[PDB]
Structure 1
Amino acid sequence: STGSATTTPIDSLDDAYITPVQIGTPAQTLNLDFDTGSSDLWVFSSETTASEVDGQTIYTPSKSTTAKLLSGATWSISYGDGSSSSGDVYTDTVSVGGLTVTGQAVESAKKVSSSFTEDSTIDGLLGLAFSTLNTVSPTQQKTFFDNAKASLDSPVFTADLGYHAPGTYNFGFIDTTAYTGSITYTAVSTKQGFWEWTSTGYAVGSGTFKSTSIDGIADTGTTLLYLPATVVSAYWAQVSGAKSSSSVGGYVFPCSATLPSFTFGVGSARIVIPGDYIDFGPISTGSSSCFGGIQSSAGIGINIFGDVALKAAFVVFNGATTPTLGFASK
């Protein structure tokens, strides 16, 4: 089997991407944030504290003939930005782009933090990291991909995120029309539960390539590219007026600037992130200070190849017995 679904930026900055997901019988379609950096499929629901719901579409298990309470199961998760959610668990039928999993754990939110309440466009998250990170207790649950894998034509999914435009998540096949050149594959460590890999280096603009190992995670659920302070300083040093602002919370730059590209290595291959991709616009409405799309990972504990990086590539998440990651230009 295979599945194919369009993923759409939630706003003009590509702050995140939402993908329609069918849950239950008859189908209830919710727009979820596919997150390769976590392993819980959770949704706004009829159980979510009413004051914490603000425009989202909710899952109502009592209206689904295939929903079953997973008795005794609870979940609670915190993300890298300090956001959080928690609740109880149902199993139900979940379909993405024509690919159906029965008995998928659908984690129903009773509580969500303010940042989720404030994102009216995100009805929940669909985790695509390794199931070892799933937070359901006392019986850990499998991701949608993990449940689907054995039935897929090939045990893979691909992320093809657009810049200021829709893109595609495919399950079970590689669309050879969706990228240019060849796909370069690179080793993955699953020891921390992430799609963790080592980049072979970087370049800033037309500058020479610096060969250096950068260990990080491929995370579709993180907006920006978070890299070591040395690398990030080298990038922003090429932008007149750019500076790290503690009050704003990262590098900012004059909105009048033309940003250089940033290249990252994947083995001997190179993925080029155009300068425009690194512009996250005014820090506040009407400001001439703009927020940078490449930021230091120093306060995070891990480097993160988030959407800014991934949207410059066609990315293969290969879930074979020994997982790997593939990157192609497009």
Structure 2
Amino acid sequence: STGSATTTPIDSLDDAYITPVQIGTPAQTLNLDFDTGSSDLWVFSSETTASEVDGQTIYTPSKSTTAKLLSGATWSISYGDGSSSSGDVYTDTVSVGGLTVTGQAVESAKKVSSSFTEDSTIDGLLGLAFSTLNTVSPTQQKTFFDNAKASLDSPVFTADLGYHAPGTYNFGFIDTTAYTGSITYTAVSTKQGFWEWTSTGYAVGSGTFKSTSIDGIADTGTTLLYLPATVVSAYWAQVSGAKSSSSVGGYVFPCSATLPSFTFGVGSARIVIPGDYIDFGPISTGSSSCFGGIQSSAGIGINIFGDVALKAAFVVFNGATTPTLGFASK
């Protein structure tokens, strides 16, 4: 089997991407944030504290003839950005782009933090990291991909995120028309539960490539590119007037600037992030200070190849017995 679904930016900045997901019988379609940095499929629901729902579409398990309470199971998750959610668990039928999993754990939120409530466009998350990170207790549950894997034509999924435009998540096949050149594959460590890999270096604009190992994660659920302070300083030094602002929470730059590209290495291959992908717009409405899309990972404890990086590539998440990651230009 295979599946193919379009993923759409939630706003004009590509802050996140939503993908429609069918849950239950008859189908209830919710727009979920596919997150290769976590491993829980959770949804706003009829159980979510009413004051914490503001415009989201909810899953109502009592209206699904295939929903079953997973007795005694609870979940609770906190994300890198400080947001959180928790609740109980159902199993139900879940389909993405024509690919169906029966008995998928659907984690129903009883509580969500303010950032989730305030974002009316995201109805929940669909985790695509390794199932070892799943938070369901006392019986850990599998991700949608883990459950689908054996049925797929090939044990892979691909992320093809757009810049200010829709893109695609495919399951079970590699669309050879969706990228240019070849796909370069690179080793993955699953030790921390992430799609963790080592970039071979970077360049800023038309500058020379610096060969240096940068361990980080491929994370579709993180907006920006978070890299070591040395790398980030080298980038922003090429933008007149750019500075790190403790009050704003990162590097800012004059909105009048033209940003240089940023290149990262994948083995001997190179992925080029155009400068415009690094512009996250005014820090507040009407400001002439703009927020940067490359930020320091210092104090996160891990480098993160988030959407800024991933949307410059066609990315293969290869879930074979020994997982790997592939990157191609597009």
Short-chain TM bin: over 0.9
Between the aligned partners of 1:6 and 1:135, the Cα distance in structure 2 is 27
**Could you give the per-residue CA deviations for residues 212-253 of structure 1, whole angstroms, max 9, x where no partner exists?**
000000000000000000000000000000000000000000
Between the aligned partners of 2:132 and 2:299, the Cα distance in structure 1 is 24
1:28 Cα deviation from its structure 2 partner? 0.0
Partner of 1:146: 146
**Could you give the per-residue CA deviations for residues 179-230 of structure 1, whole angstroms, max 9, x where no partner exists?**
0000000000000000000000000000000000000000000000000000
1:299 Cα deviation from its structure 2 partner? 1.8
CA RMSD in angstroms, aligned pairs only: 0.2
1:284 Cα deviation from its structure 2 partner? 0.1
1:125 Cα deviation from its structure 2 partner? 0.1
SS at match of 1:146: helix
Partner of 2:171: 171
Partner of 1:207: 207
SS at match of 1:175: coil
**Could you give the per-residue CA deviations for residues 258-305 of structure 1, whole angstroms, max 9, x where no partner exists?**
000000000000000000000000000000000000000002000000
1:99 Cα deviation from its structure 2 partner? 0.0
1:75 Cα deviation from its structure 2 partner? 0.1
Within the alignment, does 1:324 sit opposite 2:321 as a pair?
A: no
Between the aligned partners of 1:78 and 1:294, the Cα distance in structure 2 is 23
Specify every segment of 5 or more residues in structure 2 that has no aligned partner in the other structure, as ranges: none
1:312 Cα deviation from its structure 2 partner? 0.0
SS at match of 2:116: helix
Between the aligned partners of 2:105 and 2:306, the Cα distance in structure 1 is 26
Between the aligned partners of 1:290 and 1:179, the Cα distance in structure 2 is 31
Between the aligned partners of 2:260 and 2:86, the Cα distance in structure 1 is 41
Between the aligned partners of 1:238 and 1:216, the Cα distance in structure 2 is 24
Between the aligned partners of 2:53 and 2:247, the Cα distance in structure 1 is 30
Between the aligned partners of 1:238 and 1:70, the Cα distance in structure 2 is 54
How many residue pairs get matched? 330
Between the aligned partners of 1:116 and 1:232, the Cα distance in structure 2 is 29
Between the aligned partners of 1:86 and 1:265, the Cα distance in structure 2 is 38
1:68 Cα deviation from its structure 2 partner? 0.1
Partner of 1:29: 29
TM-score relative to the length of structure 2: 1.00
TM-score relative to the length of structure 1: 1.00
1:60 Cα deviation from its structure 2 partner? 0.1
1:51 Cα deviation from its structure 2 partner? 0.3
SS at match of 1:145: helix
SS at match of 2:85: strand
**Could you give the per-residue CA deviations for residues 143-169 of structure 1, whole angstroms, max 9, x where no partner exists?**
000000000000000000000000000
SS at match of 1:326: strand
Within the alignment, does 1:288 sit opposite 2:288 as a pair?
A: yes
1:84 Cα deviation from its structure 2 partner? 0.2
Between the aligned partners of 2:115 and 2:184, the Cα distance in structure 1 is 36
Within the alignment, does 1:67 sit opposite 2:67 as a pair?
A: yes
SS at match of 1:15: coil
Between the aligned partners of 1:119 and 1:102, the Cα distance in structure 2 is 29
Partner of 1:307: 307
Specify every segment of 5 or more residues in structure 1 that has no aligned partner in the other structure, as ranges: none
Q: Which runs of 4+ in 1 moved over 2 A?
A: none
SS at match of 1:168: strand
Between the aligned partners of 1:237 and 1:126, the Cα distance in structure 2 is 37
Between the aligned partners of 1:195 and 1:112, the Cα distance in structure 2 is 26
Between the aligned partners of 2:116 and 2:100, the Cα distance in structure 1 is 27
Partner of 2:190: 190
